[PDB]
Amino acid sequence: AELKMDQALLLIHNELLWTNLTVYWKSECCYHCLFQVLVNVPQSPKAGKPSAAAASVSTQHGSILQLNDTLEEKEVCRLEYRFGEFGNYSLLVKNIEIACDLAVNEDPVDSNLPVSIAFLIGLAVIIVISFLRLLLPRLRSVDTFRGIALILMVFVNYGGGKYWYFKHASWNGLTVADLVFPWFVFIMGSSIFLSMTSILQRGCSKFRLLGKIAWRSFLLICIGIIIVNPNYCLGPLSWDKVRIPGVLQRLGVTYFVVAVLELLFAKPVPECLSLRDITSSWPQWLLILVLEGLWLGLTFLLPVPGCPTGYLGPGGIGDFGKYPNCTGGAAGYIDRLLLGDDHLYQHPSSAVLYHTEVAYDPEGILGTINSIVMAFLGVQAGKILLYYKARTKDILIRFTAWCCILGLISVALTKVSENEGFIPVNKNLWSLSYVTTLSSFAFFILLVLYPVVDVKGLWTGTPFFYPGMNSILVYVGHEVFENYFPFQWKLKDNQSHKEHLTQNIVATALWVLIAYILYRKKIFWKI
Template identity: 60%
Template structure:
């Protein structure tokens, strides 16, 4: 089945476009790219015996040879992904032995995920002798030769030599992509063949499939509104009338969920399938806000359906509170990462989490929608002073509440005094900002969580700890960021309003989606100044910054419009295979977390330092969950919360 890799098509295209290229080199004295040459016998004799392949993924070996007489060297490195960071001392290189004509040597391991800047200073550490930037390749073997070009001017050169070429660690992605695309091609050909009457009649006669099979393989097959009205809070109902369900919503949800499962299982141990260390975006940073967005869309459609069926607001509110409580409870008790620390107890209980944030976000957005909705607003019978804003103006009380929450987020983020930190600090702490604020990780967001929840009850291993070497615990699903997740869900709810207002007016719906996407994109451009680090409010998943919400919602509107056009308007795509996990999202999410370490989702690998084996295991586990959701759909089994 082509389930998992298809959700990664966009990321793979980016990876194959930029990462299969040879890395570049910048040197201070005009030397060219590193040459693949044999070392001089004088300088390398006996050193080859020291070399060994690096034992871990994303690493390479670097042999530093110091030919400077009576001059020791201090080698320091700086990762290209570490913004305004301090150089980190790596090794001391002894001086050469002039009498034996033997250079001083040291063998070090360097990171290959991001470009590195190597800095060589004199033994005193004050004088910089040379600096070069290079993107090392995985399992490569390199030599860095430091020698004097001119004794009169004391000019020092640093020459980087490739002794053994690195492997291409991205080939497994290309292979997996081709395999899944081949499977997709087979399924498409089979689907088209079924439209030929003689072929279809022969298949039905031979296999005698049940009616359920025909429904699933049909582009129109989906549970009706009555069956799905009481499902989980992220499941939409198009209208109270017995009409066709919007498959594009479940497809979008399923796509986000499939990528989320793949990322949580490890993503083949590739850095671009992990969360960004601090500012910026990777594939892993897109899926959670998309899931929140589509939950907001579902809220709009499902509440509209329930109210049209005549349910009282009091009963609907009770159902909203109960669903939120269940999501939060499941997040704290069932899906808690601190299980890896031992038996769960109050001492090591992580309070925030993904399901907890979903539950609280659902509670706030659904309650606002229920309490302030007006009869006739969704049908367009209410008069508005501006017809172009008829899907916005009737909901001005909700907008005021959301904008008030955003003002609170801005005030707390930029005005709250944090002990030992500058006001409005948005950095990672640690060695970032040149090491001036090592204990200020997350600024006000981290401070509020540590103050109200306690350091032991939040996430202990934030993504910034690897690159920025932070020591403070920080929770990416903390209290302050929940405000912006509410805003994200509200933008999704606005997409639902568009679907309700312009029901069956496909051109209007698509135009509104595009307009919203452009507006969100323009706001992001202003907030970020179209840069990763230099904007007013950088894109940051850890903080759930406002620019992060506007950027991911821009992509969400585009993606939803594309799926709506292909799946529900033109019916060129049934939504498979993402449609099936989208119909059982809560079950798949909780199931993949609970059974993560059990066979067949995980097994003992022969080579734990192989991207190929990790990618095979993670894609297999993700595909299995898609198959499970497909089988559950066939049997009309849906987990309702």
Template identity: 60%
Template sequence: MERKELCRVHYHFGEFGNYSLVVRTDHSSQNVSCNIVINQEPVNSYLPIFFAFLIYTGIFTMLALGQFCINIEPIRNWLYKKMNPRETDRLINSELGSPRQTDSISGDLPPGVWRTGPTVPRLRSLDTFRGLALAIMVFVNYGGGKYWFFKHQSWNGLTVADLVFPWFVFIMGTSTALSLSSMLRRGCSKGQLLLKILWRSCLLFLLGIVIVNPNYCLGPLSWENLRIPGVLQRLGCTYLVVAGLELLFAKPLPDSTSVEAPLPSVRDLLPYWPQWLFMMALEVVWLCLTFLLNVPGCPRGYLGAGGIGDHGKYPNCTGGAAGYIDRLLLGEKHIYQHPSSSVLYMTTVPFDPEGILGTINSVIMAFLGLQAGKILLFYKDQHQQIMLRFCVWSIIMGAVSAALTKCSTEEGAIPVNKNLWSISYVTTLSSFAFALLLLVYGLVDVKRVWSGAPFFFLGMNSILVYVGHEIFENYFPFKWKMRDTQSHSEHLAQNLTATSLWVIISYVLYRKRIFWKI
């Protein structure tokens, strides 16, 4: 039986609206008209976001005004008279929400630089960047107010939720370059550092296994259904490769930036050409496995979601080579059972967005972050040079993404895809990361017009906050029973409250000088 399209209607449906499709046929001309009739007006689902924005803007405005008033000499003197001087000092030094500099830096360092040890400078912008990514990650994991743009994309394309994990990987690479250089400068041997890298990688992996898998209502962990991949597991594997590679070629850099070097414009690149060759070889492996591996029952180089996608031709081919490798090496029961593609594409096979093949491009992402760290090391205190290079790298990565995707969701050779961690996804997100780091670095460490609060506190205790928000996700006060589970207002209030609580917890831990480092 031949099917005939009667009409085609493009319409933006609002939430909770009631609609009817009216189809009319003009018998004289045989023309068919289709019209949407609104039976019940939809609600404005974006009003809760607007009100939340106003509330948070009001809070930060009051904090900023309080800081401004405290810095006025007459008000400062009045506080000394009316309040306990010791308590006044505490209030003034706390900067109403920004970190106290006397806690973490000595007098010979500028306000934008913090110490983590006797001689190790710490850039506030890096912790601010990490904390910003973590804040969005926590909010998204708690539900994101049930808005579609705070949920992971079903397959190709990007939402806000798809931005944060790659940024976290990126800034991990940046911090790795700085920390390894610092420890080498302090006299640590490469053997000691290698043991530290191995220990940290294993600990991240084991933490991920313990956090991702338990369901205490169903009993203890069971190997039969243990999910092996995960966020922390991928961080551990990525850190092991990138930090190990950096350690292999790393040399302690002199404190002085005035040391002459051949070809100074590329002194952050030239000494590390073997690392770039290794990364290119890794990417060739990803490309060959993705596009040349013979996957049973699937076309070679398939990048689709399977299920009912592609007119249902390849229902069991979700993720192509990436899904096949995970199912082959890890087993179907040891990978993620409910991928984001299952809702829209009705996929039936498990697929893990943190799988084996995607970890290769996660390493590439961290390595690009490592390059940002080398820029900070080699051009220390040369703010214009640093910001220029961040800008150039952002443009280069953006150009590569444009070539791979043709600036579209579906039409390019390699679409942007978070589930697959495609190379275009990495170049796109690294372009955004360099641009964001440029902005944060300029505001926090160069112009010093922003202390980095409140994201700075989250960045200083990122692992603790991530582990904590996963463990206590379903407990009060981070979650409570809602009166209306279909309400964006209630979901947004709950998710923002939970995220804000972790900001407050990280601030309290910062004031108590409690930091969980692994």
């Protein structure tokens, strides 16, 4: 029909002669949204001639429908159902009492079939190549894990097949899109410590290195603002529309703060139950815990005008529509106070599901504290790798212990619930529990990749370390060349998951190939 992607048709037939009905729709994904009007169905004029009206219901999450008499304002009938994509459904409001029956006129399609098939294709290629091949300085695992994070960032930015789980969550919880930036920050902290230790061991001065750190940070911030943020298809750059926060700006600020902290308190690596790497850097831990206490205090105790104190919700229609302009809480208030709504992100992810009107920037000022905490945990991983490079058992024990500690903290904060924790997982706020959850994930990934890629050498990292060696050039590249063929062509069906998924997979594989080609030519750009 005229159905768009991820929608179904709902035909509502009114068999009642006396009472009109109004239909209210609420998603199950919401936490405390309001019911929104779906369609108004008038009363049947004559017996045997039911009135009809159609509507489109979202099929990404389960739906909650409410039937209310428009004059009486009384609930005659309520049903909750999970509609399928491109379905054709009929709802009949019978008489004798009032009851509703939902019939499936046409069965919906399987929307996740291309994703199921894509994993089978990739799994088959892995087995075929492994079967085919069998018949016939730097840590590799850090580059491999950086390349995996970057590859998924490229796939997600292109759209992720237009799938709701390859996109960012509206407010709370995790999708696959929410995993890949914290992991990159973690790895960047590891690389900060490893590179700094090698450089200082070679005998370089700390002031030349400080100048290099400042130059790299300034370059990243400027590249983000001037190249990566703006949509130059709309028009030329004007200052009043410039968005100051961003991904590369926050990488730059995090890089400066973490690198300068490590450089200031740098120590030579000494050469087995011990806490040597934890106690030899107690000043850094002291400053990190003080900074984290600052984030917690400004988040739960800063009074925001016209808004509750310590509010972590999305606003819009969320929390029963009480707080419509309070998207973010103190984080958004600080962003608006210091930068103004026109220098923020005008399309927050909460807009689709909570219908928020205010601009909110996920990469704002207040969450940089937790970005820094994430990168400092990555630094701790690098310290584990260098202080105990001789012994593999020591490295693995420390990775496992850190994963368990951070996972226990995350379980305590979130209460293993999406919206009911003390600090729920939230990318937009860059919560504490978001950091601890994604850090335990990164410690587990290192625990698995270090033996396989580095100790045993079973796997060489292919093809993931090729973009892990040219991360900055690949990230800037796909932003500049996002609309260019062959990364993007014209689709026969823009309402198809299969066609979008094929386009995005092809474009991501092309950036893996481009990075491999740059590796063969030894064209490594280090910002």
